[PDB]
Amino acid sequence: KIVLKSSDGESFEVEEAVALESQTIAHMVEDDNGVPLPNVTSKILAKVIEYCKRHVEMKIDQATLFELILAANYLNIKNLLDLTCQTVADMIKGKTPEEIRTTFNIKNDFTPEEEEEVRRENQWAFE
Amino acid sequence: QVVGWPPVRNYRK
Amino acid sequence: SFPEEVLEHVFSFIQLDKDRNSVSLVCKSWYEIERWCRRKVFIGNCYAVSPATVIRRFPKVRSVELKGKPHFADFNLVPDGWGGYVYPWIEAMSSSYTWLEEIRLKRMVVTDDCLELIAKSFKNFKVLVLSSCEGFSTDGLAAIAATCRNLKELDLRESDVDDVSGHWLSHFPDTYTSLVSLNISCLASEVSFSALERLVTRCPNLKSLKLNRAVPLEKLATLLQRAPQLEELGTGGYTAEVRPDVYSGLSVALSGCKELRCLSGFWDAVPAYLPAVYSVCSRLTTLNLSYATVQSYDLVKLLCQCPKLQRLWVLDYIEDAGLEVLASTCKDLRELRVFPSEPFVMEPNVALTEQGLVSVSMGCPKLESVLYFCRQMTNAALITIARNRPNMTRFRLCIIEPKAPDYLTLEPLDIGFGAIVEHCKDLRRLSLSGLLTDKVFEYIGTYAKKMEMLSVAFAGDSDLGMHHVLSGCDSLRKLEIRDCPFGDKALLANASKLETMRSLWMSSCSVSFGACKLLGQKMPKLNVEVIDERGAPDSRPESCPVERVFIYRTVAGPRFDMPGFVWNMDQ
Numbered sequence: 193k194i195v196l197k198s199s200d201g202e203s204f205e206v207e208e209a210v211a212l213e214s215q216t217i218a219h220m221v222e223d224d225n226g227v228p229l230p231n232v233t234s235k236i237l238a239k240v241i242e243y244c245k246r247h248v249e250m251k252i253d254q255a256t257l258f259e260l261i262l263a264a265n266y267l268n269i270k271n272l273l274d275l276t277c278q279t280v281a282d283m284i285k286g287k288t289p290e291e292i293r294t295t296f297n298i299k300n301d302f303t304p305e306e307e308e309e310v311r312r313e314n315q316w317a318f319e
Numbered sequence: 320q321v322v323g324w325p326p327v328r329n330y331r332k
Numbered sequence: 333s334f335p336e337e338v339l340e341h342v343f344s345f346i347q348l349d350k351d352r353n354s355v356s357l358v359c360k361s362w363y364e365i366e367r368w369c370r371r372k373v374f375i376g377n378c379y380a381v382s383p384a385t386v387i388r389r390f391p392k393v394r395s396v397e398l399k400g401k402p403h404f405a406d407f408n409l410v411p412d413g414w415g416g417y418v419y420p421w422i423e424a425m426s427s428s429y430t431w432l433e434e435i436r437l438k439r440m441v442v443t444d445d446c447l448e449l450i451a452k453s454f455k456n457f458k459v460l461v462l463s464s465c466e467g468f469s470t471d472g473l474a475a476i477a478a479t480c481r482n483l484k485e486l487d488l489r490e491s492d493v494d495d496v497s498g499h500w501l502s503h504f505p506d507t508y509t510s511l512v513s514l515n516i517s518c519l520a521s522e523v524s525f526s527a528l529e530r531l532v533t534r535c536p537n538l539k540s541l542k543l544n545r546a547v548p549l550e551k552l553a554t555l556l557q558r559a560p561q562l563e564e565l566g567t568g569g570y571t572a573e574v575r576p577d578v579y580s581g582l583s584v585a586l587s588g589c590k591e592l593r594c595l596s597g598f599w600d601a602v603p604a605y606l607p608a609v610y611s612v613c614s615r616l617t618t619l620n621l622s623y624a625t626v627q628s629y630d631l632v633k634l635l636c637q638c639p640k641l642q643r644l645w646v647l648d649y650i651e652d653a654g655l656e657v658l659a660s661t662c663k664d665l666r667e668l669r670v671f672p673s674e675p676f677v678m679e680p681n682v683a684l685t686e687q688g689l690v691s692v693s694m695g696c697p698k699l700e701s702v703l704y705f706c707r708q709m710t711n712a713a714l715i716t717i718a719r720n721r722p723n724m725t726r727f728r729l730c731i732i733e734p735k736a737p738d739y740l741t742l743e744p745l746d747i748g749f750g751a752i753v754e755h756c757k758d759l760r761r762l763s764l765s766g767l768l769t770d771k772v773f774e775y776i777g778t779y780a781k782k783m784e785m786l787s788v789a790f791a792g793d794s795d796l797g798m799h800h801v802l803s804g805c806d807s808l809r810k811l812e813i814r815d816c817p818f819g820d821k822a823l824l825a826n827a828s829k830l831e832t833m834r835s836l837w838m839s840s841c842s843v844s845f846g847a848c849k850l851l852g853q854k855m856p857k858l859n860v861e862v863i864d865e866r867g868a869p870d871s872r873p874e875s876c877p878v879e880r881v882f883i884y885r886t887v888a889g890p891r892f893d894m895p896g897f898v899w900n901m902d903q
C-alpha cells in the first residue's frame with residue numbers, strides 16, 4: 193500500500209506499517225507515484241524491507257554491511273541502525289589500531305611523533 | 320614489632 | 333566512509349577503556365570522534381596526567397574514576413600530607429563537565445569544599461564512591477544530602493570521615509526518593525534513626541544498604557520491614573540481650589527479604605542471633621564475616637546453609653576444621669579471604685594453619701582468589717595448592733612472622749611459591765612472605781608472565797632478585813617492595829621497564845639518594861619521588877639510602893603539591 197522506488201528505479205510495494213518503520217519515509221509520506229529513494233540501491237532496499245517486515249511481524253559480507261548501515265542511517269530506521277552499528281562495533285572490540293585499519297581499509301594518517309604521544313597518553317593516563 | 324607489619328588495617332592491640 | 337554521526341553511534345557500543353584507546357589510534361578522524369563521545373575516564377594514578385589535559389581531550393565525560401595514594405598507604409608507610417588532593421580535579425571539572433554524573437575516588441584526600449563544590453556544580457550528579465578516602469566531615473556529607481536531588485549512590489567504603497554529627501542524613505529532603513545504594517559503614521556517628529527509617533521507606537529502588545555499628549540490632553527488623561527488596565545488606569551492631577521477641581522479629585524481617593545476595597556487618601556478633609540470617613543463606617553469594625568474633629563451630633553452622641556462596645571473608649576463627657567443611661559445601665566458591673583475629677600476637681590463638689588452605693584448594697574447583705593470613709607454612713602445602721588450583725588468578729599469602737621458614741624442613745619458601753607461579757599460568761597478582769631468597773624472584777621472573785601486581789616484604793638476598801622480576805615479568809604494572817636488600821643496581825639496570833608500569837614503591841630498601849638523582853636525570857618522563865622525613869637528602873652522603881622512593885610514569889611532569897618531605901629528582 194506504499195510504493196518505494198530504489199536508486200535503480202525499481203518499485204517495491206510494502207505494507208504501510210513496514211514503510212513507516214523509516215522516519216525518513218514517514219515524513220515523505222506525511223506529504224501517488226512512489227517514494228523515490230536516490231541513496232538506496234535495489235539490493236539494499238530489499239534487505240531493509242526484509243528487516244522491517246520481520247520486525248513489524250547479519251550473516252552478510254563486509255561491503256553489504258557498509259551499505260546497509262548507510263541506508264539505515266539515510267532511512268532513519270533506529271532498530272536497524274542499532275543492529276548494524278552493534279555488528280560493526282563487534283568488529284572493533286579486542287583489536288589493535290592496525291588490525292582495525294586492516295579490517296576497515298583505513299590508512300594511518302598520524303605522524304609517528306603524533307601517534308607516539310597519543311599512545312603514551314592513552315596507556316599512561318587512561319588505561 | 321615492625322611498622323605496618325602484618326599488613327592489616329586493624330588498630331594495634 | 334561513515335558519516336560522523338554513524339561512527340559516533342558505532343562507538344556508543346564500545347565501552348571498555350582499552351577498546352576506546354585503540355579506536356582513538358586508528359586514524360586522526362577516529363581520534364576526534366572518539367574523544368567527543370567518551371563517557372567514562374579511568375585515571376589509575378591522579379599524577380599521571382593533569383585535570384586540564386583530561387578535560388581538553390574528553391569534553392563530554394559523565395563518569396570519572398581517580399586513584400591517588402599507592403596501596404602501601406594502607407599500612408602507614410606513606411606519611412600524612414604526601415598528596416592525592418582531588419580538589420584540583422573538582423575545580424577543573426566544575427566549569428567544564430556540567431553534565432557529570434559519577435565520581436569514584438580511591439585513596440584521595442577529599443575535603444568539605446570538594447563535596448560542597450560537587451553539590452553545587454553537577455545538577456545530574458548520581459554516584460559518589462569514596463573508597464579509603466580521608467579529609468572530609470559529616471558537614472560535607474550534609475551538603476551532598478541537601479543539594480544532590482538526583483543522587484542514587486553514596487558509598488563511603490573504608491573512608492576516614494570527621495564524625496562531627498549524625499544529623500547530615502536528615503538533610504535529604506522529603507521530596508528525595510532516588511537512593512539505590514547507601515554505604516555508611518565507616519561512620520562512627522549515629523544518624524537519626526527516624527530520619528533513616530523515613531529515607532528507606534521513601535526510596536523504592538534502594539537495593540544496597542550497609543549500615544554503621546550505631547544502628548543497634550533491635551532496630552534492624554524495622555528497617556528491613558521497609559526495604560524487603562534489598563539485594564545487599566550490611567547490618568549495624570549485631571548484639572542484644574538474648575530474647576525470643578527480638579529474635580523472632582529479626583527472623584521474620586530477614587525471611588521477608590527474598591532478593592538478598594550479599595550480607596555483611598555483624599559487629600560484635602553474638603552467636604545467639606546468627607541463626608536469624610539462615611533463611612537468607614540459601615541464596616547468598618557474598619558473606620562478609622570479617623568483624624564477627626564468633627568461634628569455629630558457630631561459623632560452620634552458618635556456612636553449612638550457604639551452598640551458593642561465591643565470596644567469603646572470614647576471621648581465622650574459622651580454623652582448619654571450618655575450612656574443611658567449607659571445601660565440602662561451597663562448590664561455587666571463587667574467593668576466600670581469611671583475616672587474622674590477633675595479628676599482633678606471635679603465638680597462635682587459633683588452629684588455623686596451612687592445612688585449611690590446602691583443604692579449600694582441593695575442594696573448591698572455581699577458587700581463583702585467596703588472601704590468607706597464617707602463622708606457619710610449608711613448601712609441600714604450597715606445591716599441593718598450586719597443583720590443585722592451576723586456575724588461580726590472585727594469590728596473597730601473609731605469614732605473620734617475617735622470614736619464617738617452612739616449619740617442617742626449615743627451608744626458604746622459594747620452591748613453594750615457585751610452584752604457584754609455575755602452575756598458575758594466569759596468575760595476575762601475587763603477594764608472598766616467609767623466608768625467601770633471590771631464587772624465588774628467579775622463578776617469578778621465569779614463570780609469572782601474566783602477573784600484574786606483586787607485593788614483597790622482608791625477602792631476597794641481593795639486587796639479582798629485583799632484576800629477575802623487572803627483567804622477566806612481562807605484564808607487570810605495579811611492584812611494591814619493603815624491607816628488602818634491593819637497591820641501585822637493579823633499579824638502574826632496568827630503568828626503561830619503569831615506563832611500562834604504573835608505579836614502583838620501595839621503602840626501607842637499599843636505594844641511595846645518588847641513584848634516585850641519576851634515575852631522575854635519565855628518565856625525565858618518570859616522577860622519581862624521594863619521601864624521607866629526615867630533612868634534605870643532600871644533607872647526607874649521596875650513597876645514603878633514602879627512607880622511601882616512589883616512582884611513576886607521568887605525562888604531566890613534576891607534581892605541584894609536594895610537601896616538605898617529598899623531592900622530585902627532575903630539574
Ligand SMILES: O=P(O)(O)O[C@H]1[C@H](OP(=O)(O)O)[C@@H](OP(=O)(O)O)[C@H](OP(=O)(O)O)[C@@H](OP(=O)(O)O)[C@H]1OP(=O)(O)O
Nearest residue numbers: 376399401402403404406438701726760761784785809810
Ligand atoms: O586494576 P587496578 O587499578 O590495578 O585495581 C586493583 C583491582 O581493583 P579494581 O577492581 O579497582 O580494578 C583489585 O581487584 P582484584 O582484581 O585484585 O579483586 C583491587 O584489589 P582488592 O580486590 O583487594 O580490592 C586492588 O586494590 P588493592 O591494591 O587495595 O588490594 C586494585 O589496586 P589499586 O586500587 O591499589 O591500584
Ligand SMILES: O=C(O)Cc1cccc2ccccc12
Nearest residue numbers: 326728729730763764787789
Ligand atoms: O597482599 C596483601 O594484602 C597481604 C600481603 C601478603 C604477603 C606479602 C605482603 C607484602 C606487602 C604487603 C602486603 C602483603
